[PDB]
C-alpha cells in the first residue's frame, strides 16, 4: 500500500508566496479523546519549507495576583508537548496542535460563557528547520479571545486520491461547529466531585 | 584491555554511497529485560558520518476518536528516550533503539494477532552532527505494519577480532525468530490482574 | 482591540549601545501568587536584538558538605522553567523571570535575616536568537547577596498609550518595597506543620 | 567583595595546546551530601575555549539479558543532570560532574569488591559553545573500570589569592583517598531495610 514516508526518508505528500498557510486563522476548543482541548493547525512556510520543528505556546494577559499586584502583560505557559516530546514536530503535512486543558493549564477554568468577557492572546512560536538550506528559522502567530472558537472542530485536510496522499489547503482554515459542553475543565471536575454519591 | 573510546575521545571502531545502512530494514517486537519492546537498528550515514544525534519516533495512522471524528492521519508519540535522555545518541557503532511498550505507549494494546489487520507507519527521525563539518543534518525512515516483525530479534553486529572492535554490517539488517508471547502489553497486565488470588 | 502579536508574527511593541537593559541591576525576593519567589528582569541586547531565548540560573557559593569537605565554589541549580518549558522565552518586551522557592530549591531555607551573613552569587545565562542574522549568542549577569533585595517588587514597564503597547525602560531597573514575610520557605512550611491542631 | 561574574557577564577567573585538561584522568566513587556519587572533573579545551556546554554520560558494557541474549556492547544512560538541567553547564572554571547513584542508575549495585571483576566503560560527551567563534564543538573521554577510583575524592582547584579567583590546574587530575563505605547503593538500601526493627 501507499506509504507517507519511503524507507529512505522521502515524504510522499502532495501539497503564492504570502505566508498564510503556516498557522490556521482560528484556534478551537472542543472534545478530543474524552478531553476538552485547545487546538490550532500548523502547515508550513511557502518560501522556506520545513520538515522538522519545535513548537511552544504562551498565554499573554493582564492579571492581578492574589497579592493585589497588577501584571500588565503576564506570560503563562501552555503545554503543547514538552511533557511528551510531542512539541518536536514532523511536518509531513498539516498538524492539529493540541493543548489538553487540565489543572496545570492556565485555561483550566475557561468556559464558553467566561469567553465573552475574558481578554487574552495565545501566542504560538514555531522554530523550524528549512529543508533547502539546513538552517533554522522561526514563525509566530497569535489568537486573541475573539479568534478562539468554542465548540468548533477542524475539517480534515488529508486524503488519498490515486496513490497520492493529498493535502487540501482550501480546508486548512476551515472549522465546523459540533455539540460541545459549555463548562470549563475545572467545572467538569467540580461536577464530577459532586456526582459521587 | 582494548577500549571503545580513547582518553582523548577517539573511537576505536572498525566499520558504497547509497544510504542503506542508516536504519534497519525492519523493526521487531520481542522481549528484552522482561519487557515487550519495539526495536529497530540505527547505524550511520555513509556520505556524512555522525557521532552525536537525537532520535524521535512518531506513529502515523488513521483513527476515529471516541467523539466519532475520523482522523485521516494522526501522529502519536513513541517514547524512545525523552524520559531518560537515551534519545541523545552516541553513534560509536550501530545501536538498537528501544521503545518499551507500556500504558503510555500507542502500542500498549498491540498484539501479534491484531497486527494482521492493523495499519500504521512508525516514522523515525534522526538529526545528527556530521563529524567532518560540524553542521547538522537529518535522516528519516519508516516501518509500515508489514515491516514490523513480531517475535524477532536483531543479530549482534559488534565483536573483537585482534584488538579491533569490529562492526559486521552484513548482519546490520539481520533478525531471527525467538519464542515470544503473542499478547499485547495491556493483555499481559490484564492477565496479571486476573492472576491475583 | 490592539494586539501584542499580529497574525503574521509581527510584534507590536514600542521600546545607546552600552548593554545595560539586558538584565535588571537587582533581583528581589517577595510574594507572587501565594509563593515567595526570587525574581529578576530580562529585557534585550541593544546591539543584537533577540525574540527567542533560553534562560538558566546557577547558584554559586562555597560550602562544606556533611562529609566535612569544603567546596570552594559549588554550583547549585536554580529552577527557572525547565520543569514547565517556561525557560524557553518569548522576548516581546521585558520579562520578570521567576524562581519559585520550594524544598527542591537551594534557597529553600533562605530567610531575610540569614541574608545578612550569607554569601553567594546568582548567575544568569541567557542564550538567545538574534533576530537580524538568525545566529545564536549569549548574555550573562550576576547577583551577589547584596544585590538580592528581600521584600522588593519590580515596577511594571508595559502600558498602552494610543494603540501602542509601550515599554518604559526608565523603570526597567526600578523596584519598590512591599510588606513581605521575613521567613524562609522551609520556616513557612515548618510553621505550617506546627499550626496543625 | 570579589565576584566570579561581573554584572555585564565577564568572568573573573584566572586559569600548551595538547587537550589534556578537558576531563580528569580518573573518575571517583565516594560520599557527597550523604550520597555515594560517581564523579569526574571537566575543565575546558585549550584550543577552543567554551563557556556554555551540555554534558551526557553513557555506560558501555557487554551483558546478558534475562532472556539469555548476549549484548556485545550495550549503552546504559548515566544521569548527569537531565532531571534538573544540571547537565547544561556554565564553564567558569573546572566542575566536578556528579552522578548520584540510585535505583535508576546502572551502577545501583556496583560495590568496591564487584569492581575487581566488573568490566565497563563510562563514556562522557560534552558539546560546548566555543566563546571565540560562537559555533559548536564536542569533546569526549572514557573511563574504563580501572580508571574509576572507589573511595577517592578530587582535590579542590579554586582559590582566591589577591582579588583573583585562581584555578590551579596542577591539581586538576589530583585525587586523594577518604574513608568510604565499600557497599553498593542497593546494598546500603538492603541494609536499611533490614535495620528496621
PDB file of N, CA and C in Angstrom, chain B residues 39-129:
ATOM      1  N   UNK B  39      11.795  -2.527  18.625  1.00  0.00           N
ATOM      2  CA  UNK B  39      13.183  -2.190  18.354  1.00  0.00           C
ATOM      3  C   UNK B  39      13.498  -2.080  16.875  1.00  0.00           C
ATOM      4  N   UNK B  40      14.468  -1.224  16.561  1.00  0.00           N
ATOM      5  CA  UNK B  40      14.962  -1.045  15.201  1.00  0.00           C
ATOM      6  C   UNK B  40      16.414  -0.637  15.362  1.00  0.00           C
ATOM      7  N   UNK B  41      17.212  -0.878  14.340  1.00  0.00           N
ATOM      8  CA  UNK B  41      18.621  -0.560  14.432  1.00  0.00           C
ATOM      9  C   UNK B  41      19.034   0.688  13.662  1.00  0.00           C
ATOM     10  N   UNK B  42      19.923   1.490  14.260  1.00  0.00           N
ATOM     11  CA  UNK B  42      20.461   2.682  13.589  1.00  0.00           C
ATOM     12  C   UNK B  42      21.978   2.526  13.472  1.00  0.00           C
ATOM     13  N   UNK B  43      22.517   2.932  12.329  1.00  0.00           N
ATOM     14  CA  UNK B  43      23.944   2.826  12.105  1.00  0.00           C
ATOM     15  C   UNK B  43      24.529   4.192  11.844  1.00  0.00           C
ATOM     16  N   UNK B  44      24.599   4.581  10.578  1.00  0.00           N
ATOM     17  CA  UNK B  44      25.165   5.882  10.229  1.00  0.00           C
ATOM     18  C   UNK B  44      25.004   6.206   8.740  1.00  0.00           C
ATOM     19  N   UNK B  45      25.282   7.461   8.392  1.00  0.00           N
ATOM     20  CA  UNK B  45      25.218   7.919   7.010  1.00  0.00           C
ATOM     21  C   UNK B  45      26.612   7.786   6.387  1.00  0.00           C
ATOM     22  N   UNK B  46      26.675   7.062   5.276  1.00  0.00           N
ATOM     23  CA  UNK B  46      27.919   6.795   4.555  1.00  0.00           C
ATOM     24  C   UNK B  46      28.579   8.045   3.942  1.00  0.00           C
ATOM     25  N   UNK B  47      27.760   9.017   3.545  1.00  0.00           N
ATOM     26  CA  UNK B  47      28.259  10.253   2.940  1.00  0.00           C
ATOM     27  C   UNK B  47      28.399  11.417   3.925  1.00  0.00           C
ATOM     28  N   UNK B  48      27.928  11.220   5.155  1.00  0.00           N
ATOM     29  CA  UNK B  48      28.007  12.243   6.198  1.00  0.00           C
ATOM     30  C   UNK B  48      27.993  11.567   7.569  1.00  0.00           C
ATOM     31  N   UNK B  49      29.156  11.059   7.965  1.00  0.00           N
ATOM     32  CA  UNK B  49      29.317  10.358   9.230  1.00  0.00           C
ATOM     33  C   UNK B  49      29.054  11.226  10.470  1.00  0.00           C
ATOM     34  N   UNK B  50      28.193  10.714  11.345  1.00  0.00           N
ATOM     35  CA  UNK B  50      27.827  11.393  12.581  1.00  0.00           C
ATOM     36  C   UNK B  50      28.312  10.599  13.798  1.00  0.00           C
ATOM     37  N   UNK B  51      28.523  11.309  14.909  1.00  0.00           N
ATOM     38  CA  UNK B  51      28.951  10.691  16.170  1.00  0.00           C
ATOM     39  C   UNK B  51      27.872  10.959  17.220  1.00  0.00           C
ATOM     40  N   UNK B  52      27.302  12.157  17.156  1.00  0.00           N
ATOM     41  CA  UNK B  52      26.244  12.580  18.060  1.00  0.00           C
ATOM     42  C   UNK B  52      24.942  12.727  17.254  1.00  0.00           C
ATOM     43  N   UNK B  53      23.798  12.541  17.916  1.00  0.00           N
ATOM     44  CA  UNK B  53      22.491  12.648  17.255  1.00  0.00           C
ATOM     45  C   UNK B  53      21.298  12.538  18.218  1.00  0.00           C
ATOM     46  N   UNK B  54      20.152  13.072  17.810  1.00  0.00           N
ATOM     47  CA  UNK B  54      18.946  12.937  18.618  1.00  0.00           C
ATOM     48  C   UNK B  54      17.957  12.171  17.768  1.00  0.00           C
ATOM     49  N   UNK B  55      17.234  11.249  18.391  1.00  0.00           N
ATOM     50  CA  UNK B  55      16.258  10.448  17.670  1.00  0.00           C
ATOM     51  C   UNK B  55      14.855  10.573  18.265  1.00  0.00           C
ATOM     52  N   UNK B  56      13.855  10.608  17.386  1.00  0.00           N
ATOM     53  CA  UNK B  56      12.462  10.665  17.800  1.00  0.00           C
ATOM     54  C   UNK B  56      11.639   9.752  16.900  1.00  0.00           C
ATOM     55  N   UNK B  57      10.490   9.320  17.402  1.00  0.00           N
ATOM     56  CA  UNK B  57       9.655   8.380  16.675  1.00  0.00           C
ATOM     57  C   UNK B  57       8.198   8.783  16.780  1.00  0.00           C
ATOM     58  N   UNK B  58       7.503   8.732  15.645  1.00  0.00           N
ATOM     59  CA  UNK B  58       6.083   9.079  15.564  1.00  0.00           C
ATOM     60  C   UNK B  58       5.303   7.897  14.978  1.00  0.00           C
ATOM     61  N   UNK B  59       4.118   7.641  15.518  1.00  0.00           N
ATOM     62  CA  UNK B  59       3.258   6.593  14.993  1.00  0.00           C
ATOM     63  C   UNK B  59       2.202   7.297  14.146  1.00  0.00           C
ATOM     64  N   UNK B  60       2.192   7.017  12.848  1.00  0.00           N
ATOM     65  CA  UNK B  60       1.220   7.615  11.945  1.00  0.00           C
ATOM     66  C   UNK B  60       0.128   6.613  11.621  1.00  0.00           C
ATOM     67  N   UNK B  61      -1.121   7.028  11.787  1.00  0.00           N
ATOM     68  CA  UNK B  61      -2.236   6.150  11.493  1.00  0.00           C
ATOM     69  C   UNK B  61      -3.541   6.927  11.431  1.00  0.00           C
ATOM     70  N   UNK B  62      -4.546   6.296  10.823  1.00  0.00           N
ATOM     71  CA  UNK B  62      -5.891   6.849  10.722  1.00  0.00           C
ATOM     72  C   UNK B  62      -6.616   6.291  11.930  1.00  0.00           C
ATOM     73  N   UNK B  63      -7.536   7.070  12.484  1.00  0.00           N
ATOM     74  CA  UNK B  63      -8.303   6.607  13.625  1.00  0.00           C
ATOM     75  C   UNK B  63      -9.537   7.448  13.871  1.00  0.00           C
ATOM     76  N   UNK B  64     -10.490   6.843  14.568  1.00  0.00           N
ATOM     77  CA  UNK B  64     -11.730   7.502  14.913  1.00  0.00           C
ATOM     78  C   UNK B  64     -11.698   7.765  16.414  1.00  0.00           C
ATOM     79  N   UNK B  65     -11.809   9.034  16.789  1.00  0.00           N
ATOM     80  CA  UNK B  65     -11.805   9.415  18.197  1.00  0.00           C
ATOM     81  C   UNK B  65     -13.109   8.934  18.849  1.00  0.00           C
ATOM     82  N   UNK B  66     -13.162   8.890  20.195  1.00  0.00           N
ATOM     83  CA  UNK B  66     -14.369   8.456  20.913  1.00  0.00           C
ATOM     84  C   UNK B  66     -15.556   9.354  20.565  1.00  0.00           C
ATOM     85  N   UNK B  67     -15.262  10.543  20.039  1.00  0.00           N
ATOM     86  CA  UNK B  67     -16.289  11.514  19.655  1.00  0.00           C
ATOM     87  C   UNK B  67     -16.869  11.230  18.275  1.00  0.00           C
ATOM     88  N   UNK B  68     -16.316  10.228  17.598  1.00  0.00           N
ATOM     89  CA  UNK B  68     -16.792   9.862  16.278  1.00  0.00           C
ATOM     90  C   UNK B  68     -16.047  10.538  15.147  1.00  0.00           C
ATOM     91  N   UNK B  69     -15.058  11.350  15.493  1.00  0.00           N
ATOM     92  CA  UNK B  69     -14.287  12.047  14.476  1.00  0.00           C
ATOM     93  C   UNK B  69     -13.220  11.152  13.861  1.00  0.00           C
ATOM     94  N   UNK B  70     -13.171  11.133  12.536  1.00  0.00           N
ATOM     95  CA  UNK B  70     -12.171  10.354  11.832  1.00  0.00           C
ATOM     96  C   UNK B  70     -10.955  11.238  11.552  1.00  0.00           C
ATOM     97  N   UNK B  71      -9.799  10.783  12.022  1.00  0.00           N
ATOM     98  CA  UNK B  71      -8.551  11.495  11.812  1.00  0.00           C
ATOM     99  C   UNK B  71      -7.828  10.711  10.713  1.00  0.00           C
ATOM    100  N   UNK B  72      -7.786  11.264   9.482  1.00  0.00           N
ATOM    101  CA  UNK B  72      -7.133  10.625   8.334  1.00  0.00           C
ATOM    102  C   UNK B  72      -5.698  10.206   8.629  1.00  0.00           C
ATOM    103  N   UNK B  73      -4.941  11.101   9.254  1.00  0.00           N
ATOM    104  CA  UNK B  73      -3.556  10.807   9.589  1.00  0.00           C
ATOM    105  C   UNK B  73      -3.213  11.490  10.888  1.00  0.00           C
ATOM    106  N   UNK B  74      -3.187  10.708  11.957  1.00  0.00           N
ATOM    107  CA  UNK B  74      -2.862  11.237  13.268  1.00  0.00           C
ATOM    108  C   UNK B  74      -1.448  10.785  13.643  1.00  0.00           C
ATOM    109  N   UNK B  75      -0.728  11.622  14.384  1.00  0.00           N
ATOM    110  CA  UNK B  75       0.614  11.267  14.819  1.00  0.00           C
ATOM    111  C   UNK B  75       0.613  11.049  16.325  1.00  0.00           C
ATOM    112  N   UNK B  76       1.115   9.895  16.739  1.00  0.00           N
ATOM    113  CA  UNK B  76       1.186   9.546  18.142  1.00  0.00           C
ATOM    114  C   UNK B  76       2.645   9.390  18.513  1.00  0.00           C
ATOM    115  N   UNK B  77       3.012   9.964  19.646  1.00  0.00           N
ATOM    116  CA  UNK B  77       4.378   9.930  20.141  1.00  0.00           C
ATOM    117  C   UNK B  77       4.817   8.543  20.619  1.00  0.00           C
ATOM    118  N   UNK B  78       5.992   8.104  20.165  1.00  0.00           N
ATOM    119  CA  UNK B  78       6.554   6.815  20.576  1.00  0.00           C
ATOM    120  C   UNK B  78       7.844   7.104  21.344  1.00  0.00           C
ATOM    121  N   UNK B  79       7.766   6.993  22.666  1.00  0.00           N
ATOM    122  CA  UNK B  79       8.893   7.265  23.553  1.00  0.00           C
ATOM    123  C   UNK B  79      10.134   6.425  23.246  1.00  0.00           C
ATOM    124  N   UNK B  80      11.198   7.082  22.780  1.00  0.00           N
ATOM    125  CA  UNK B  80      12.452   6.388  22.500  1.00  0.00           C
ATOM    126  C   UNK B  80      13.623   6.965  23.306  1.00  0.00           C
ATOM    127  N   UNK B  81      13.305   7.521  24.467  1.00  0.00           N
ATOM    128  CA  UNK B  81      14.337   8.058  25.327  1.00  0.00           C
ATOM    129  C   UNK B  81      14.170   9.465  25.862  1.00  0.00           C
ATOM    130  N   UNK B  82      13.106  10.177  25.501  1.00  0.00           N
ATOM    131  CA  UNK B  82      12.958  11.534  26.013  1.00  0.00           C
ATOM    132  C   UNK B  82      12.823  11.572  27.538  1.00  0.00           C
ATOM    133  N   UNK B  83      12.401  10.464  28.135  1.00  0.00           N
ATOM    134  CA  UNK B  83      12.236  10.413  29.586  1.00  0.00           C
ATOM    135  C   UNK B  83      13.465   9.881  30.331  1.00  0.00           C
ATOM    136  N   UNK B  84      14.594   9.793  29.632  1.00  0.00           N
ATOM    137  CA  UNK B  84      15.846   9.341  30.241  1.00  0.00           C
ATOM    138  C   UNK B  84      17.027  10.112  29.634  1.00  0.00           C
ATOM    139  N   UNK B  85      16.855  10.564  28.395  1.00  0.00           N
ATOM    140  CA  UNK B  85      17.916  11.262  27.698  1.00  0.00           C
ATOM    141  C   UNK B  85      18.566  10.236  26.788  1.00  0.00           C
ATOM    142  N   UNK B  86      18.003   9.027  26.776  1.00  0.00           N
ATOM    143  CA  UNK B  86      18.504   7.942  25.937  1.00  0.00           C
ATOM    144  C   UNK B  86      18.300   8.265  24.453  1.00  0.00           C
ATOM    145  N   UNK B  87      17.482   9.275  24.164  1.00  0.00           N
ATOM    146  CA  UNK B  87      17.258   9.682  22.776  1.00  0.00           C
ATOM    147  C   UNK B  87      18.411  10.538  22.237  1.00  0.00           C
ATOM    148  N   UNK B  88      19.344  10.917  23.113  1.00  0.00           N
ATOM    149  CA  UNK B  88      20.527  11.694  22.722  1.00  0.00           C
ATOM    150  C   UNK B  88      21.580  10.613  22.516  1.00  0.00           C
ATOM    151  N   UNK B  89      21.767  10.215  21.264  1.00  0.00           N
ATOM    152  CA  UNK B  89      22.670   9.131  20.895  1.00  0.00           C
ATOM    153  C   UNK B  89      24.154   9.392  20.765  1.00  0.00           C
ATOM    154  N   UNK B  90      24.921   8.335  21.034  1.00  0.00           N
ATOM    155  CA  UNK B  90      26.372   8.320  20.874  1.00  0.00           C
ATOM    156  C   UNK B  90      26.567   7.204  19.841  1.00  0.00           C
ATOM    157  N   UNK B  91      26.711   7.593  18.574  1.00  0.00           N
ATOM    158  CA  UNK B  91      26.879   6.659  17.447  1.00  0.00           C
ATOM    159  C   UNK B  91      28.287   6.105  17.222  1.00  0.00           C
ATOM    160  N   UNK B  92      28.812   5.372  18.199  1.00  0.00           N
ATOM    161  CA  UNK B  92      30.155   4.787  18.103  1.00  0.00           C
ATOM    162  C   UNK B  92      30.138   3.549  17.185  1.00  0.00           C
ATOM    163  N   UNK B  93      28.949   2.977  17.034  1.00  0.00           N
ATOM    164  CA  UNK B  93      28.703   1.784  16.234  1.00  0.00           C
ATOM    165  C   UNK B  93      27.180   1.645  16.212  1.00  0.00           C
ATOM    166  N   UNK B  94      26.640   0.653  15.477  1.00  0.00           N
ATOM    167  CA  UNK B  94      25.179   0.505  15.440  1.00  0.00           C
ATOM    168  C   UNK B  94      24.535   0.424  16.823  1.00  0.00           C
ATOM    169  N   UNK B  95      23.298   0.907  16.912  1.00  0.00           N
ATOM    170  CA  UNK B  95      22.543   0.900  18.165  1.00  0.00           C
ATOM    171  C   UNK B  95      21.142   0.359  17.941  1.00  0.00           C
ATOM    172  N   UNK B  96      20.668  -0.453  18.877  1.00  0.00           N
ATOM    173  CA  UNK B  96      19.315  -0.982  18.810  1.00  0.00           C
ATOM    174  C   UNK B  96      18.447  -0.032  19.648  1.00  0.00           C
ATOM    175  N   UNK B  97      17.652   0.782  18.960  1.00  0.00           N
ATOM    176  CA  UNK B  97      16.769   1.741  19.620  1.00  0.00           C
ATOM    177  C   UNK B  97      15.597   0.977  20.222  1.00  0.00           C
ATOM    178  N   UNK B  98      15.276   1.283  21.473  1.00  0.00           N
ATOM    179  CA  UNK B  98      14.201   0.590  22.153  1.00  0.00           C
ATOM    180  C   UNK B  98      13.028   1.448  22.586  1.00  0.00           C
ATOM    181  N   UNK B  99      11.830   0.950  22.300  1.00  0.00           N
ATOM    182  CA  UNK B  99      10.606   1.602  22.735  1.00  0.00           C
ATOM    183  C   UNK B  99       9.946   0.582  23.658  1.00  0.00           C
ATOM    184  N   UNK B 100      10.042   0.803  24.961  1.00  0.00           N
ATOM    185  CA  UNK B 100       9.430  -0.119  25.910  1.00  0.00           C
ATOM    186  C   UNK B 100       7.928   0.149  25.925  1.00  0.00           C
ATOM    187  N   UNK B 101       7.161  -0.841  25.480  1.00  0.00           N
ATOM    188  CA  UNK B 101       5.709  -0.722  25.422  1.00  0.00           C
ATOM    189  C   UNK B 101       5.062  -0.783  26.814  1.00  0.00           C
ATOM    190  N   UNK B 102       4.300   0.255  27.147  1.00  0.00           N
ATOM    191  CA  UNK B 102       3.601   0.333  28.427  1.00  0.00           C
ATOM    192  C   UNK B 102       2.269   1.069  28.237  1.00  0.00           C
ATOM    193  N   UNK B 103       1.579   1.362  29.337  1.00  0.00           N
ATOM    194  CA  UNK B 103       0.290   2.047  29.273  1.00  0.00           C
ATOM    195  C   UNK B 103       0.335   3.431  28.610  1.00  0.00           C
ATOM    196  N   UNK B 104       1.522   4.040  28.554  1.00  0.00           N
ATOM    197  CA  UNK B 104       1.700   5.361  27.936  1.00  0.00           C
ATOM    198  C   UNK B 104       1.952   5.272  26.431  1.00  0.00           C
ATOM    199  N   UNK B 105       2.255   4.064  25.957  1.00  0.00           N
ATOM    200  CA  UNK B 105       2.552   3.816  24.550  1.00  0.00           C
ATOM    201  C   UNK B 105       1.340   3.560  23.676  1.00  0.00           C
ATOM    202  N   UNK B 106       1.359   4.092  22.446  1.00  0.00           N
ATOM    203  CA  UNK B 106       0.259   3.910  21.496  1.00  0.00           C
ATOM    204  C   UNK B 106       0.127   2.420  21.141  1.00  0.00           C
ATOM    205  N   UNK B 107       1.201   1.665  21.370  1.00  0.00           N
ATOM    206  CA  UNK B 107       1.237   0.225  21.092  1.00  0.00           C
ATOM    207  C   UNK B 107       0.875  -0.653  22.297  1.00  0.00           C
ATOM    208  N   UNK B 108       0.395  -0.021  23.367  1.00  0.00           N
ATOM    209  CA  UNK B 108       0.007  -0.691  24.611  1.00  0.00           C
ATOM    210  C   UNK B 108      -0.850  -1.933  24.373  1.00  0.00           C
ATOM    211  N   UNK B 109      -1.801  -1.832  23.451  1.00  0.00           N
ATOM    212  CA  UNK B 109      -2.674  -2.960  23.148  1.00  0.00           C
ATOM    213  C   UNK B 109      -2.411  -3.592  21.773  1.00  0.00           C
ATOM    214  N   UNK B 110      -1.162  -3.557  21.317  1.00  0.00           N
ATOM    215  CA  UNK B 110      -0.833  -4.165  20.029  1.00  0.00           C
ATOM    216  C   UNK B 110      -0.383  -5.596  20.269  1.00  0.00           C
ATOM    217  N   UNK B 111      -1.134  -6.557  19.744  1.00  0.00           N
ATOM    218  CA  UNK B 111      -0.773  -7.958  19.907  1.00  0.00           C
ATOM    219  C   UNK B 111      -0.375  -8.538  18.549  1.00  0.00           C
ATOM    220  N   UNK B 112       0.181  -9.750  18.564  1.00  0.00           N
ATOM    221  CA  UNK B 112       0.596 -10.434  17.341  1.00  0.00           C
ATOM    222  C   UNK B 112      -0.562 -10.618  16.354  1.00  0.00           C
ATOM    223  N   UNK B 113      -1.731 -10.995  16.872  1.00  0.00           N
ATOM    224  CA  UNK B 113      -2.910 -11.203  16.037  1.00  0.00           C
ATOM    225  C   UNK B 113      -3.502  -9.910  15.477  1.00  0.00           C
ATOM    226  N   UNK B 114      -3.543  -8.851  16.287  1.00  0.00           N
ATOM    227  CA  UNK B 114      -4.088  -7.564  15.842  1.00  0.00           C
ATOM    228  C   UNK B 114      -3.226  -6.962  14.734  1.00  0.00           C
ATOM    229  N   UNK B 115      -1.970  -7.404  14.669  1.00  0.00           N
ATOM    230  CA  UNK B 115      -1.007  -6.966  13.662  1.00  0.00           C
ATOM    231  C   UNK B 115      -1.526  -7.239  12.259  1.00  0.00           C
ATOM    232  N   UNK B 116      -2.194  -8.377  12.088  1.00  0.00           N
ATOM    233  CA  UNK B 116      -2.748  -8.784  10.798  1.00  0.00           C
ATOM    234  C   UNK B 116      -3.643  -7.736  10.142  1.00  0.00           C
ATOM    235  N   UNK B 117      -4.511  -7.118  10.941  1.00  0.00           N
ATOM    236  CA  UNK B 117      -5.453  -6.119  10.439  1.00  0.00           C
ATOM    237  C   UNK B 117      -5.052  -4.667  10.653  1.00  0.00           C
ATOM    238  N   UNK B 118      -4.179  -4.435  11.630  1.00  0.00           N
ATOM    239  CA  UNK B 118      -3.711  -3.091  11.959  1.00  0.00           C
ATOM    240  C   UNK B 118      -3.007  -2.446  10.765  1.00  0.00           C
ATOM    241  N   UNK B 119      -3.067  -1.126  10.709  1.00  0.00           N
ATOM    242  CA  UNK B 119      -2.464  -0.377   9.622  1.00  0.00           C
ATOM    243  C   UNK B 119      -1.844   0.880  10.222  1.00  0.00           C
ATOM    244  N   UNK B 120      -0.529   1.005  10.095  1.00  0.00           N
ATOM    245  CA  UNK B 120       0.177   2.144  10.665  1.00  0.00           C
ATOM    246  C   UNK B 120       1.540   2.344  10.026  1.00  0.00           C
ATOM    247  N   UNK B 121       2.232   3.386  10.466  1.00  0.00           N
ATOM    248  CA  UNK B 121       3.549   3.674   9.946  1.00  0.00           C
ATOM    249  C   UNK B 121       4.384   4.305  11.046  1.00  0.00           C
ATOM    250  N   UNK B 122       5.422   3.596  11.469  1.00  0.00           N
ATOM    251  CA  UNK B 122       6.325   4.083  12.501  1.00  0.00           C
ATOM    252  C   UNK B 122       7.412   4.888  11.799  1.00  0.00           C
ATOM    253  N   UNK B 123       7.370   6.207  11.952  1.00  0.00           N
ATOM    254  CA  UNK B 123       8.356   7.078  11.326  1.00  0.00           C
ATOM    255  C   UNK B 123       9.458   7.404  12.330  1.00  0.00           C
ATOM    256  N   UNK B 124      10.701   7.265  11.893  1.00  0.00           N
ATOM    257  CA  UNK B 124      11.865   7.533  12.726  1.00  0.00           C
ATOM    258  C   UNK B 124      12.604   8.752  12.175  1.00  0.00           C
ATOM    259  N   UNK B 125      12.947   9.674  13.063  1.00  0.00           N
ATOM    260  CA  UNK B 125      13.651  10.884  12.676  1.00  0.00           C
ATOM    261  C   UNK B 125      14.924  11.032  13.498  1.00  0.00           C
ATOM    262  N   UNK B 126      16.061  11.065  12.813  1.00  0.00           N
ATOM    263  CA  UNK B 126      17.349  11.213  13.471  1.00  0.00           C
ATOM    264  C   UNK B 126      18.015  12.475  12.956  1.00  0.00           C
ATOM    265  N   UNK B 127      18.327  13.388  13.863  1.00  0.00           N
ATOM    266  CA  UNK B 127      19.003  14.619  13.490  1.00  0.00           C
ATOM    267  C   UNK B 127      20.376  14.530  14.125  1.00  0.00           C
ATOM    268  N   UNK B 128      21.386  14.302  13.288  1.00  0.00           N
ATOM    269  CA  UNK B 128      22.742  14.158  13.778  1.00  0.00           C
ATOM    270  C   UNK B 128      23.768  15.179  13.340  1.00  0.00           C
ATOM    271  N   UNK B 129      24.886  15.163  14.063  1.00  0.00           N
ATOM    272  CA  UNK B 129      26.015  16.054  13.836  1.00  0.00           C
ATOM    273  C   UNK B 129      27.069  15.386  12.958  1.00  0.00           C
TER     274      UNK B 129
END
